[PDB]
């Protein structure tokens, strides 16, 4: 009716899940065949979150180094979703490989076993990357995103900690599919996804009928942080300040135009913190320490990712066609 938000459809891969067998997207129907937890012995801790503890492990059956993601308690439904998405996407370009699924017989805590990537913490790696290296790795992330989008899946948590890079090998893997979801046209999704600094404006203004283009806003945040050496690029103290930090750079004219296009009801607590902002030029962030990473092609690409209107952003495949990537040896 007249008070609804205006509906939205993905511009690309719109109907791909509609035309699949139901079992492809119906993760609640998925059945796990448990492996043998005794195959895996923990060697070292790698990472810990609200949802998981992650270890380097040895598969004692083949002496292979693996990674074990011990899942903190969440609905069984969410565990099947991450597993089904990983199985659907397994073998795709730069997608992490799920190797096994096991459970503690005592605590019943389930665990995902993955391909190991010999990551370098982004807080060390990114400040060492050349202009070439940034274009190269951005192109590798786009191969994963065009792949997962083409497979009807939105990642919904694109950020450095979910991008594993074995820099020795120039090997990149997009990991963490625990917040990923199947794109169905017209479906309203939870806006409480992604991480604050990488949340798209659609999530911050509570627009639920979003799509793959969310991941392209996140990727823009990563690119900005990289080329300008400013991590994170949009550093909000909360979801509301996050949109103010965005609006202070991209300006409020295109934001209000976005809110008006989709008839979004702005939470009226924005009424006193947002105001009106000029659109700044991407050149205000360029300086002696980062100028070697910045080019007209880089700023043009970033401008085409960081758009309020999700429908206006480059898709992953349109991004792969951008002049910024012409120098990447393919």
């Amino acid at each position: 009716g007249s008070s609804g938000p205006v509906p939205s459809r993905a511009r690309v891969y719109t109907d791909v899940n509609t035309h699949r067998p139901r079992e492809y997207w119906d993760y609640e129907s998925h059945v796990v065949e448990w492996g043998n937890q005794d195959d895996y012995q923990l060697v070292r801790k790698l990472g810990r979150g609200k949802y998981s503890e992650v270890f380097e492990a040895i598969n004692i059956t083949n002496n292979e180094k693996v990674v074990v993601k011990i899942l903190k308690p969440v609905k069984k439904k969410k565990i099947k979703r991450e597993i089904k998405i990983l199985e659907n996407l397994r073998g795709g370009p730069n997608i992490i490989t799920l190797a096994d699924i096991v459970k503690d017989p005592v605590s019943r805590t389930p665990a995902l076993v993955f391909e190991h990537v010999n990551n370098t913490d982004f807080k060390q790696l990114y400040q060492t990357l050349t202009d070439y290296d940034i274009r190269f790795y951005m192109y590798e992330i786009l191969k994963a995103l065009d792949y997962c989008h083409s497979m009807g899946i939105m990642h919904r948590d694109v950020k450095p900690h979910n991008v594993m890079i074995d820099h020795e090998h120039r090997k990149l893997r997009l990991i963490d599919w625990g917040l990923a979801e199947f794109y169905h046209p017209g479906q309203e999704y939870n806006v409480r996804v992604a991480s604050r600094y990488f949340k798209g404006p659609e999530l911050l203004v509570d627009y639920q009928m979003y799509d793959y283009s969310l991941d392209m806003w996140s990727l823009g945040c990563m690119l900005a942080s990289m080329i300008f050496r400013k991590e994170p690029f949009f550093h909000g103290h909360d979801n509301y300040d996050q949109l103010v930090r965005i609006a202070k750079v991209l300006g409020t004219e295109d934001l209000y135009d976005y809110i008006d296009k989709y008839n979004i009801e702005l939470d009226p607590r924005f009424n006193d913190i947002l105001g009106r902002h000029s659109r700044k030029r991407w050149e205000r962030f360029v300086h002696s320490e980062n100028q070697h990473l910045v080019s007209p092609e880089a700023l043009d690409f970033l401008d085409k990712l960081l758009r309020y209107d999700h429908q206006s952003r480059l898709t992953a495949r349109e991004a792969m066609e951008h002049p910024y990537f012409y120098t990447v040896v393919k």
Partner: peptide, 8 residues
């Protein structure tokens, strides 16, 4: 020595 069922 064990954590969530896994041997060290």
């Amino acid at each position: 020595c064990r954590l969530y069922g896994f041997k060290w």
